[PDB]
Amino acid sequence: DLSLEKAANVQWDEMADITGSSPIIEVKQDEDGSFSIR
Amino acid sequence: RPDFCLEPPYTGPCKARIIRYFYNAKAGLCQTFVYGGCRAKRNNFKSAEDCMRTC
Amino acid sequence: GALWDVPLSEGVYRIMQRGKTQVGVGIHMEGVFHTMWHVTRGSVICHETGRLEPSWADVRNDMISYGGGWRLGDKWDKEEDVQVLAIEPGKNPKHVQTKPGLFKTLTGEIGAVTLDFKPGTAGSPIINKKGKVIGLYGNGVVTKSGDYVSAITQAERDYEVDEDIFRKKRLTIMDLHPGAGKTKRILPSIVREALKRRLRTLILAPTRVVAAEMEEALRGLPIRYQTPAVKSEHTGREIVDLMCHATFTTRLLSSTRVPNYNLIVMDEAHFTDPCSVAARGYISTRVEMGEAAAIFMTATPPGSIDPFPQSNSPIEDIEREIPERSWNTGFDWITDYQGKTVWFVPSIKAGNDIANCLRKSGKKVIQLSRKTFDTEYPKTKLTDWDFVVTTDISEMGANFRAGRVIDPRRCLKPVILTDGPERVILAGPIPVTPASAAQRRGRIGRNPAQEDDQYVFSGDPLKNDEDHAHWTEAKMLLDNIYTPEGIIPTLFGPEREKTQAIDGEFRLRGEQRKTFVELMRRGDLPVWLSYKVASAGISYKDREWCFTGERNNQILEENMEVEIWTREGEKKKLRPKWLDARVYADPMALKDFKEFASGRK
């Protein structure tokens, strides 16, 4: 039912741009490895 | 029909793409939505059958 | 974490599904496919290069391996920027750099990134400055803002054994159920530290295929497989001897150079085979002598009674009527089910009837018996099938990728009758033992992927194997095994009350013992028959006793009075002086025995 396909190789791109933020949020894990908000 | 059929289709906080079925409470039938992989609500079926049978 | 259970490329990949949808992403590093649990949940990874199956699975952390453990150790250091190699459905890969925030869980904290990519980017590698994968994108949470934040999920990485299991004059019984990583995790660790203690280690497998699986699991370690074609084989180098239970017993019966193994491990130590019971007796004696430590690994230790032990994967226990022979209708649930099924039959004949019946409805069927096991079991994986119709032989380490087991809980039992002329009959079909039922059921409930394995059974087990011939036969074998002065080799404790036979009543003279061994290992005769012939002073080549028997010892085949042409060229009726049912139980056994009676074996 599942097939695979080549995409890329593990490499750090020096020409990449910076985005995103760095906040601190309280997580509460679960048995299935999920996440929630404490 | 159950009270979780109330709920809109819920793509969870995971980033996979697993096509599932939700009971539309808008139109009156069942139809596909994208499931994330984790934290599935009850309004989430692996087939159009189960969705139509439950609701 | 946890292990898995089943009998080349480079880079990151799009995990695609048929129904060419993309469902997730993975990373092939070190020769292992790394991906997230919620993406596949243990589903097979089919590709041109073949297939990949689960190996390591930490559901509590949403991670899963394909083709080995995980060589992904590089973790974030709370003060360094990373990239996410996002591979979205229907788009070229992207490298998004973001200095990570923190997921302060309840216990305790792990790095996380505020990136929001399309569904199907689960498993996208988070990259180091050195160019190493540092975690997986795909498992996160939404905040009060409605913004998405994913965590940098990362693995951390065997079995630490107790020291007193190596202590002499100690016999430890390890209760290991299917899916414990017994063969792949426990045993290699045991051997590994056994070598560190410089111990002379002996490993015993019930069959050749199990020993082969051990070799697979013990690669890189100094293991030498020992064949029954060799009485003894000593090398100066440090080494672990791997052999079958029967090989060990044979060497005990025919060799003088049997080394003092101070650590003996027997896998599937519930094997009720005469050679196995005798082996357990000898091993127990060596332990009692304070010369060795012993480890008996089995899912059904002495005292086991529960036919429904808990498995690592859910088992549906269904009780209903099961066909004893071929059928025409009224059992649609058997054929309409097309997962793979393992059907346990009381005998080879009943197996033949069932197998033929299944084949006549378009079902691919593989049959398994005692003598065809080491040849026919390997094709239960290199080929694909619908039903494995097997005898009790599959209750010893035989691993199938099946979803259902059909178990009418019946079997045959060899019994030694003393109604005047001593004889051996096959009593049955009678109910199996609770342990046997547990082991037959144990063929499934092993795969963490499937959560709906079915154990279809009928009737109840019965603890009535006191009159089983194997206990007596084991005593026959064990009586012809030399021991020091005062030390008498009796059966294994919990198995000795089963027999009423006294000690040493079967010890044979020097040459007659050799005849006994040859009759068993070259004539392929049962222990009882071999003992009866050898104790009578009869040589191996003398086959006259096959025709000397009384009238009712006449052997039948297909309702015919069997007749044999001897090597000299004389036509005699097959009528053995001593009658053992097991030599005319099934066609092949009768063929072999007829070859023996002709003097052509």
XYZ file of C-alpha atoms in Angstrom:
694
model
C 0.000 0.000 0.000
C 2.981 2.279 0.614
C 5.587 3.366 -1.936
C 8.816 5.352 -1.612
C 10.357 8.104 -3.741
C 13.638 10.037 -3.708
C 13.410 13.661 -2.581
C 16.753 14.957 -1.307
C 19.886 14.254 0.720
C 20.700 15.496 4.224
C 22.453 18.842 3.790
C 22.596 22.219 5.526
C 21.735 24.981 3.066
C 23.891 28.068 3.600
C 21.721 29.984 1.126
C 18.559 29.499 3.195
C 16.619 32.361 4.793
C 15.618 32.858 8.432
C 12.000 32.764 9.618
C 9.983 31.706 12.669
C 9.952 32.597 16.355
C 11.314 31.038 19.548
C 8.605 30.997 22.255
C 8.233 28.816 25.352
C 4.970 26.871 25.532
C 3.893 24.274 28.099
C 3.383 20.863 26.508
C 1.649 17.807 27.955
C 2.620 14.542 26.279
C 0.454 11.460 25.751
C 0.693 7.669 25.433
C 0.442 7.845 21.638
C 3.277 10.375 21.597
C 0.928 13.277 20.929
C 1.011 16.799 22.355
C -1.348 19.170 24.156
C -1.331 22.533 25.927
C -0.721 22.616 29.679
C -27.041 10.050 15.159
C -24.332 10.486 17.858
C -23.266 13.815 19.364
C -19.710 13.741 18.014
C -21.103 13.965 14.488
C -21.716 17.515 15.680
C -17.990 18.222 15.436
C -16.378 19.607 12.252
C -13.593 17.562 10.572
C -10.521 17.700 12.806
C -7.025 17.704 11.353
C -4.858 17.185 14.425
C -1.521 18.744 15.476
C 0.478 16.213 13.437
C 1.766 16.864 9.926
C 1.023 13.665 8.014
C -1.516 13.455 5.194
C -3.974 10.626 5.812
C -7.263 10.888 3.919
C -10.152 10.092 6.259
C -13.922 10.571 6.309
C -15.975 13.074 8.287
C -19.732 13.446 8.646
C -20.637 16.839 7.228
C -23.124 18.537 9.523
C -23.568 21.179 6.850
C -24.577 19.163 3.832
C -26.139 15.881 4.955
C -23.622 13.294 3.770
C -20.107 11.970 4.471
C -16.993 13.261 2.719
C -13.202 13.223 2.835
C -10.876 15.374 4.929
C -7.140 15.401 5.651
C -6.130 13.774 8.941
C -2.842 14.741 10.578
C -2.063 11.427 12.249
C -2.639 12.085 15.946
C -5.442 13.137 18.317
C -8.289 11.858 16.147
C -11.725 12.972 17.304
C -14.688 10.609 17.009
C -15.800 12.406 13.843
C -13.068 10.547 11.966
C -13.598 7.388 9.920
C -11.367 5.096 7.856
C -14.182 4.610 5.343
C -17.274 6.280 3.911
C -19.206 3.239 5.147
C -18.542 3.598 8.883
C -19.311 7.311 8.607
C -22.668 6.671 6.932
C -23.506 3.825 9.310
C -22.725 5.815 12.448
C -24.653 8.763 11.015
C 11.936 1.469 23.536
C 10.490 -1.680 21.987
C 11.521 -4.218 19.350
C 9.573 -5.773 16.470
C 8.989 -9.238 15.018
C 9.323 -10.613 11.475
C 11.198 -13.663 10.050
C 19.914 -0.262 -0.263
C 19.593 3.446 -1.086
C 20.518 6.942 0.139
C 18.757 10.140 1.208
C 15.369 11.323 2.446
C 12.188 9.958 0.875
C 8.544 10.756 0.241
C 6.429 8.048 1.852
C 3.729 7.568 -0.785
C 0.431 5.671 -0.570
C -1.760 4.062 -3.233
C -5.278 4.247 -1.814
C 0.080 8.320 -5.671
C -0.686 10.302 -2.510
C 2.049 11.515 -0.151
C 1.460 10.652 3.507
C 4.874 11.342 5.045
C 8.660 11.684 4.899
C 11.561 9.483 6.041
C 15.362 9.423 6.300
C 17.621 6.527 5.304
C 20.727 6.858 7.477
C 23.399 4.276 8.366
C 21.300 1.665 6.537
C 18.118 2.296 8.492
C 14.902 4.034 7.455
C 13.961 6.663 10.059
C 10.372 7.919 10.231
C 7.505 8.894 12.536
C 4.995 6.466 14.053
C 1.777 8.326 13.210
C 2.786 8.293 9.542
C 2.918 4.528 8.990
C 2.044 2.859 12.315
C 4.084 -0.198 11.356
C 2.834 -0.604 7.790
C 5.184 -2.301 5.320
C 7.539 -0.156 3.241
C 7.259 -1.539 -0.291
C 9.800 -0.333 -2.857
C 11.796 -1.447 -5.919
C 14.686 -2.541 -3.691
C 12.308 -4.845 -1.823
C 10.438 -4.367 1.440
C 11.167 -2.800 4.824
C 9.594 -3.934 8.096
C 9.436 -2.366 11.596
C 12.307 -2.982 14.024
C 12.325 -0.298 16.721
C 9.119 1.447 17.785
C 8.681 4.104 20.466
C 4.993 5.037 20.286
C 5.323 7.209 23.396
C 7.679 9.413 21.375
C 6.094 8.854 17.947
C 9.092 7.259 16.206
C 9.558 4.046 14.199
C 12.389 2.261 12.361
C 12.650 0.167 9.201
C 15.516 -2.306 8.859
C 17.226 -2.102 12.235
C 17.527 0.183 15.249
C 18.134 3.924 15.087
C 21.514 5.520 14.453
C 20.190 9.029 15.052
C 21.889 10.390 18.158
C 22.562 14.051 17.379
C 20.328 16.206 19.581
C 19.706 19.952 19.888
C 21.641 21.869 22.552
C 19.119 24.566 23.552
C 21.316 27.286 22.008
C 21.851 26.730 18.276
C 19.941 27.352 15.040
C 18.591 24.552 12.835
C 17.031 23.976 9.416
C 13.919 22.015 8.532
C 14.260 20.130 5.266
C 10.568 20.435 4.445
C 9.386 18.084 1.710
C 5.807 19.032 0.852
C 3.400 17.070 -1.383
C 3.850 17.964 -5.049
C 6.705 20.389 -4.413
C 10.503 20.546 -4.369
C 12.258 20.323 -0.967
C 12.872 23.510 1.026
C 15.408 24.484 3.690
C 13.851 26.709 6.360
C 16.192 28.003 9.069
C 14.712 29.006 12.434
C 16.235 29.410 15.896
C 14.084 26.984 17.938
C 11.912 27.743 20.951
C 11.286 25.254 23.744
C 8.652 22.627 24.484
C 8.678 22.569 28.269
C 6.670 19.428 28.734
C 5.510 18.229 32.140
C 8.744 16.212 32.302
C 10.556 17.984 31.062
C 11.765 20.029 28.047
C 12.639 19.490 24.379
C 13.483 21.864 21.529
C 10.797 22.937 19.073
C 10.316 25.023 15.918
C 7.570 27.443 14.853
C 7.216 26.228 11.271
C 3.948 25.340 9.546
C 4.226 23.191 6.419
C 1.654 21.292 4.345
C 0.105 17.985 5.504
C 2.496 15.200 4.516
C 5.674 16.867 5.748
C 5.761 14.616 8.806
C 9.182 12.998 9.037
C 11.042 15.884 7.422
C 14.596 15.983 8.839
C 15.700 18.793 11.141
C 19.292 19.518 10.208
C 22.493 20.326 12.118
C 25.183 22.871 11.258
C 27.477 19.899 10.657
C 24.818 18.449 8.368
C 23.427 15.790 10.689
C 19.768 15.014 11.343
C 18.898 16.413 14.765
C 15.229 15.456 14.956
C 11.953 14.999 13.095
C 9.351 17.555 12.043
C 5.735 16.411 12.197
C 4.643 16.102 15.824
C 3.665 19.347 17.534
C 0.827 21.422 18.966
C -1.247 24.556 18.314
C -1.054 27.552 20.664
C -3.724 30.014 21.811
C -2.811 32.207 18.844
C -3.799 29.493 16.387
C -0.157 29.182 15.372
C 1.472 25.798 14.792
C 4.618 24.731 16.645
C 6.338 21.396 16.001
C 8.767 19.667 18.359
C 12.200 18.297 17.502
C 11.456 14.627 18.193
C 14.637 12.603 18.673
C 15.598 9.077 19.748
C 18.072 8.411 22.559
C 19.979 5.234 21.712
C 19.737 -4.043 24.742
C 19.130 -6.062 27.910
C 21.111 -6.129 31.157
C 21.104 -9.659 32.576
C 21.438 -10.635 36.235
C 24.878 -11.869 37.281
C 23.673 -14.927 39.203
C 22.316 -16.576 36.053
C 25.974 -17.309 35.320
C 26.569 -18.590 38.854
C 27.333 -22.314 38.975
C 24.884 -24.791 40.536
C 22.082 -22.517 39.340
C 19.312 -23.232 36.839
C 17.377 -20.170 35.690
C 14.151 -20.468 33.704
C 13.420 -17.407 31.580
C 9.716 -16.938 30.867
C 9.823 -15.151 27.513
C 6.719 -14.556 25.394
C 6.712 -13.937 21.597
C 7.666 -10.306 21.014
C 10.211 -9.996 23.814
C 13.199 -9.654 21.508
C 14.304 -13.007 22.919
C 16.336 -14.158 19.927
C 17.559 -10.708 18.887
C 18.134 -8.830 22.155
C 18.271 -11.125 25.185
C 20.280 -14.077 23.853
C 22.947 -11.946 22.130
C 23.456 -10.020 25.378
C 23.679 -13.243 27.388
C 26.307 -14.614 25.006
C 28.137 -11.271 24.848
C 28.802 -11.083 28.594
C 29.264 -14.861 28.742
C 32.333 -14.245 26.594
C 33.491 -11.446 28.899
C 33.433 -13.983 31.730
C 35.430 -16.345 29.495
C 32.723 -19.006 29.797
C 32.497 -22.151 27.672
C 29.021 -21.508 26.285
C 26.665 -24.011 24.653
C 23.484 -22.850 22.923
C 20.726 -25.341 22.136
C 18.023 -24.751 19.530
C 15.053 -27.086 18.982
C 15.394 -27.128 15.182
C 17.842 -26.132 12.443
C 15.788 -23.106 11.383
C 15.709 -21.675 14.916
C 19.470 -22.142 15.193
C 19.743 -20.374 11.840
C 17.734 -17.467 13.243
C 20.145 -17.452 16.181
C 23.083 -17.251 13.774
C 21.322 -14.316 12.125
C 21.000 -12.648 15.523
C 24.502 -13.582 16.693
C 26.406 -12.245 13.673
C 29.706 -10.640 14.648
C 30.114 -13.005 17.587
C 32.265 -16.180 17.541
C 29.597 -18.861 17.033
C 30.255 -22.305 15.590
C 27.354 -24.445 14.416
C 27.794 -28.087 15.395
C 26.333 -30.804 13.173
C 25.264 -34.295 14.352
C 27.640 -35.716 11.726
C 30.430 -34.935 14.200
C 30.729 -36.569 17.633
C 32.885 -33.801 19.127
C 34.893 -30.801 17.910
C 37.309 -28.863 20.128
C 39.057 -25.641 19.119
C 41.574 -23.791 21.281
C 39.994 -20.437 20.450
C 37.257 -18.905 22.590
C 33.945 -19.826 20.991
C 30.255 -20.539 21.518
C 28.847 -23.852 20.309
C 25.435 -23.752 18.653
C 23.647 -27.038 17.993
C 20.258 -28.757 18.096
C 18.888 -30.517 21.188
C 19.043 -33.851 19.372
C 22.622 -33.178 18.271
C 23.642 -32.610 21.894
C 21.975 -35.824 23.079
C 23.490 -37.752 20.169
C 26.987 -36.522 21.014
C 26.340 -37.526 24.623
C 25.448 -41.026 23.432
C 28.337 -41.555 21.018
C 31.261 -39.336 22.058
C 33.873 -39.283 24.820
C 35.124 -35.739 24.326
C 31.957 -33.899 25.351
C 33.438 -30.707 26.851
C 32.465 -29.272 30.225
C 30.304 -26.348 29.157
C 29.972 -24.249 32.310
C 27.129 -22.249 30.774
C 24.331 -23.995 28.890
C 21.432 -22.140 27.280
C 18.458 -24.079 25.915
C 15.846 -22.241 23.864
C 12.287 -23.578 23.719
C 13.048 -25.759 26.736
C 9.469 -27.052 26.764
C 10.131 -29.318 23.772
C 8.724 -32.672 24.882
C 10.897 -34.538 22.368
C 12.778 -37.493 23.962
C 16.184 -36.058 23.023
C 15.208 -32.682 24.479
C 13.975 -34.174 27.760
C 17.133 -36.274 28.023
C 19.182 -33.156 27.304
C 17.405 -31.279 30.093
C 18.141 -34.184 32.419
C 21.855 -34.207 31.627
C 22.112 -30.414 31.849
C 20.298 -30.414 35.195
C 22.750 -33.066 36.391
C 25.755 -30.963 35.354
C 24.277 -28.012 37.241
C 23.675 -30.214 40.280
C 27.303 -31.341 39.999
C 28.302 -27.702 40.419
C 30.035 -27.810 37.051
C 27.714 -25.549 35.071
C 25.086 -22.822 35.054
C 21.950 -23.284 32.949
C 19.339 -21.074 31.294
C 16.051 -22.531 30.051
C 14.164 -20.091 27.815
C 10.489 -20.817 27.133
C 7.053 -19.176 27.098
C 5.672 -22.212 28.920
C 7.860 -23.099 31.940
C 6.990 -26.055 34.228
C 3.678 -25.405 35.975
C 2.195 -23.432 33.085
C -1.550 -23.940 32.901
C -2.923 -20.743 31.339
C -3.875 -21.407 27.686
C -4.583 -17.693 27.228
C -1.477 -15.834 28.413
C -1.283 -12.088 27.790
C 0.497 -11.145 24.565
C 2.297 -7.939 23.584
C -0.286 -7.512 20.829
C -4.068 -8.003 21.252
C -5.485 -11.455 20.522
C -9.148 -12.148 19.833
C -9.975 -15.529 21.359
C -12.852 -17.039 19.392
C -14.490 -20.357 20.279
C -16.436 -22.196 17.571
C -16.802 -25.501 15.721
C -13.770 -26.485 13.646
C -13.725 -29.166 10.900
C -11.916 -32.390 11.809
C -11.785 -33.475 8.170
C -12.544 -32.151 4.682
C -15.844 -30.289 4.352
C -18.234 -29.054 1.665
C -20.070 -26.199 3.386
C -21.064 -24.608 6.687
C -17.616 -23.131 7.293
C -17.481 -19.992 5.144
C -15.652 -18.109 7.904
C -12.591 -20.230 7.113
C -12.293 -19.419 3.410
C -13.858 -15.942 3.306
C -11.084 -14.871 5.664
C -8.001 -14.048 3.615
C -5.367 -12.977 6.030
C -2.801 -15.713 6.544
C -3.846 -18.598 8.783
C -1.954 -21.248 10.753
C -4.022 -24.409 11.230
C -2.829 -26.987 13.766
C -3.855 -30.565 12.981
C -3.690 -33.654 15.236
C -1.790 -35.639 12.596
C -0.152 -35.650 9.164
C -3.124 -37.509 7.672
C -5.741 -35.075 8.981
C -3.409 -32.345 7.775
C -3.417 -33.885 4.305
C -7.217 -34.019 4.235
C -7.623 -30.424 5.425
C -4.883 -29.110 3.127
C -6.354 -30.839 0.077
C -9.818 -29.522 0.937
C -8.482 -25.973 1.202
C -6.547 -26.303 -2.060
C -9.690 -27.473 -3.869
C -11.254 -24.084 -3.121
C -8.333 -22.117 -4.541
C -6.246 -21.704 -1.389
C -2.448 -21.933 -1.498
C -1.538 -24.365 1.287
C 1.819 -25.205 2.876
C 2.034 -28.323 5.050
C 4.466 -28.793 7.936
C 5.497 -31.981 9.731
C 8.327 -33.211 11.971
C 10.449 -34.542 9.111
C 9.642 -31.914 6.478
C 9.943 -28.917 8.806
C 13.523 -27.808 8.092
C 12.777 -27.923 4.357
C 9.174 -26.703 4.151
C 9.221 -23.958 6.798
C 11.658 -21.727 4.854
C 9.174 -21.505 1.954
C 6.554 -20.010 4.272
C 8.248 -16.651 3.717
C 10.135 -16.809 0.407
C 6.765 -17.715 -1.089
C 3.340 -16.352 -0.178
C 0.446 -18.531 0.911
C -3.019 -18.662 2.469
C -2.874 -21.504 4.989
C -0.116 -23.287 6.873
C -1.488 -26.675 7.898
C 0.949 -27.918 10.519
C 1.368 -30.534 13.218
C 2.656 -29.843 16.737
C 6.140 -29.196 15.316
C 5.227 -25.531 14.762
C 4.958 -25.140 18.543
C 8.751 -24.811 18.694
C 10.064 -21.391 17.685
C 8.284 -21.444 14.325
C 7.479 -17.831 13.448
C 4.803 -16.921 10.906
C 3.560 -13.575 9.622
C -0.060 -14.567 10.199
C -3.255 -12.968 11.472
C -5.222 -16.049 12.499
C -4.590 -19.437 14.101
C -7.104 -22.269 13.793
C -6.622 -24.677 16.684
C -9.059 -27.569 17.286
C -6.780 -28.352 20.266
C -6.309 -31.997 19.279
C -3.205 -34.175 18.960
C -1.885 -37.733 18.962
C -0.040 -39.279 21.904
C 2.435 -42.171 21.700
C 1.782 -44.578 24.580
C 3.678 -47.708 25.622
C 1.144 -50.464 26.310
C 1.963 -53.331 28.669
C -1.083 -55.511 28.007
C 1.209 -58.515 27.727
C 3.328 -57.874 24.600
C 4.877 -54.416 24.999
C 3.745 -52.107 22.206
C 3.525 -48.445 21.205
C 0.243 -47.004 19.949
C -0.813 -43.551 18.790
C -3.717 -42.598 21.037
C -5.938 -39.843 19.686
C -7.037 -37.401 18.555
C -7.059 -36.314 22.209
C -7.053 -32.809 23.752
C -3.670 -31.068 23.802
C -1.931 -29.742 26.904
C -2.540 -26.204 28.226
C 1.079 -25.401 27.349
C 0.606 -26.674 23.798
C -2.566 -24.609 23.420
C -0.649 -21.574 24.671
C 2.173 -22.215 22.200
C -0.173 -22.764 19.248
C -1.925 -19.531 20.196
C 1.528 -17.981 20.530
C 2.028 -18.075 16.763
C 0.078 -14.807 16.663
C -0.351 -11.689 18.780
C 3.292 -10.967 18.018
C 3.051 -8.045 15.590
C 2.450 -4.564 17.106
C 1.058 -3.448 13.735
C -2.039 -5.646 13.496
C -4.312 -5.107 16.495
C -6.854 -7.765 15.546
C -5.163 -11.172 15.469
C -7.623 -14.045 15.881
C -7.166 -17.296 17.791
C -10.011 -19.556 16.671
C -10.198 -22.644 18.877
C -12.428 -25.521 19.972
C -12.621 -27.644 23.115
C -10.486 -27.473 26.253
C -6.888 -28.561 26.959
C -6.160 -31.575 29.165
C -3.285 -32.314 31.540
C -3.165 -36.044 30.816
C 0.237 -36.835 29.316
C 1.567 -38.988 32.161
C 1.479 -42.092 29.970
C 3.287 -40.276 27.156
C 5.991 -42.493 25.652
C 8.476 -39.611 25.466
C 9.234 -39.677 29.201
C 10.146 -43.361 29.088
C 12.086 -42.904 25.856
C 13.981 -39.974 27.371
C 14.911 -42.237 30.268
C 16.143 -44.788 27.727
C 18.413 -42.184 26.144
C 19.581 -40.734 29.454
C 20.430 -44.164 30.874
C 23.019 -44.608 28.128
C 24.899 -41.420 29.010
C 28.042 -41.896 31.109
C 28.441 -39.862 34.303
C 30.943 -39.792 37.213
C 30.773 -42.036 40.289
C 27.709 -41.342 42.422
C 26.241 -38.878 39.940
C 23.221 -40.473 38.268
C 21.592 -38.610 35.343
C 17.827 -38.566 35.867
C 15.175 -36.522 34.053
C 14.539 -32.839 34.727
C 12.760 -32.529 38.089
C 9.340 -31.127 37.055
C 9.245 -33.732 34.249
C 10.350 -36.837 36.159
C 7.171 -37.467 38.164
C 5.535 -37.871 34.743
C 7.236 -41.242 34.253
C 7.082 -44.210 36.623
C 10.185 -45.819 35.126
C 13.088 -46.303 37.531
C 16.698 -45.253 36.946
C 19.304 -47.153 34.938
C 16.917 -49.906 33.872
C 17.753 -49.164 30.229
C 21.562 -49.012 30.292
C 22.998 -51.136 27.480
C 26.333 -52.887 26.935
C 29.172 -51.303 24.961
C 28.378 -52.488 21.437
C 24.605 -52.762 21.913
C 24.543 -49.091 22.903
C 26.234 -48.299 19.590
C 23.594 -50.355 17.782
C 20.972 -48.369 19.697
C 22.442 -45.048 18.537
C 22.755 -46.177 14.918
C 19.194 -47.535 14.867
C 17.948 -44.099 15.934
C 20.200 -41.741 13.985
C 20.788 -43.829 10.853
C 17.759 -46.119 10.757
C 15.551 -43.183 11.754
C 13.653 -45.473 14.122
C 11.869 -44.351 17.319
C 13.754 -44.588 20.626
C 11.506 -47.362 21.956
C 11.815 -49.590 18.888
C 15.554 -48.942 18.650
C 16.027 -49.870 22.309
C 13.946 -53.020 21.886
C 15.997 -54.182 18.898
C 19.395 -53.216 20.326
C 18.790 -54.755 23.758
C 17.918 -58.034 22.039
C 21.495 -58.191 20.768
C 20.413 -57.640 17.171
C 22.973 -55.970 14.901
C 22.058 -52.960 12.768
C 22.151 -54.857 9.469
C 20.041 -57.765 10.733
C 16.488 -57.047 9.570
C 14.925 -60.456 10.244
C 12.952 -59.077 13.198
C 10.854 -57.038 10.758
C 9.109 -60.258 9.719
C 9.203 -62.393 12.874
C 6.221 -60.802 14.617
C 2.916 -62.374 15.616
C -0.146 -62.195 13.351
C -1.539 -58.929 14.733
C 1.809 -57.219 14.141
C 0.980 -57.235 10.430
C 1.489 -53.748 8.998
C -1.219 -52.305 6.758
C -0.971 -49.702 4.001
C -4.151 -48.507 2.275
C -5.939 -51.543 3.751
C -3.354 -53.859 2.180
C -1.160 -56.338 3.998
C 2.214 -54.701 3.326
C 4.730 -56.952 1.583
C 8.450 -56.304 1.214
C 11.118 -57.642 -1.137
C 14.304 -58.165 0.871
C 17.814 -57.362 -0.351
C 18.426 -61.049 -1.068
C 15.280 -60.945 -3.188
C 12.769 -62.723 -0.969
C 9.131 -61.677 -0.610
C 8.105 -61.351 3.042
C 5.101 -59.861 4.830
C 6.010 -56.786 6.878
C 5.340 -58.106 10.372
C 7.741 -56.631 12.987
C 8.571 -58.499 16.199
C 8.101 -55.219 18.057
C 5.269 -52.933 16.972
C 5.636 -49.153 17.028
C 2.705 -47.217 15.551
C 4.953 -44.283 14.643
C 6.657 -46.247 11.854
C 3.382 -46.700 9.965
C 1.563 -43.574 11.148
C 1.900 -41.629 7.899
C 2.905 -42.513 4.298
C 6.459 -41.135 4.537
C 7.263 -42.877 7.827
C 6.000 -46.131 6.337
C 8.072 -45.598 3.186
C 11.221 -45.019 5.242
C 10.494 -48.016 7.465
C 9.870 -50.170 4.394
C 13.247 -49.048 3.053
C 14.728 -50.131 6.381
C 13.028 -53.532 6.342
C 14.376 -54.162 2.838
C 17.930 -53.602 4.046
C 18.325 -50.707 1.624
C 18.942 -48.224 4.436
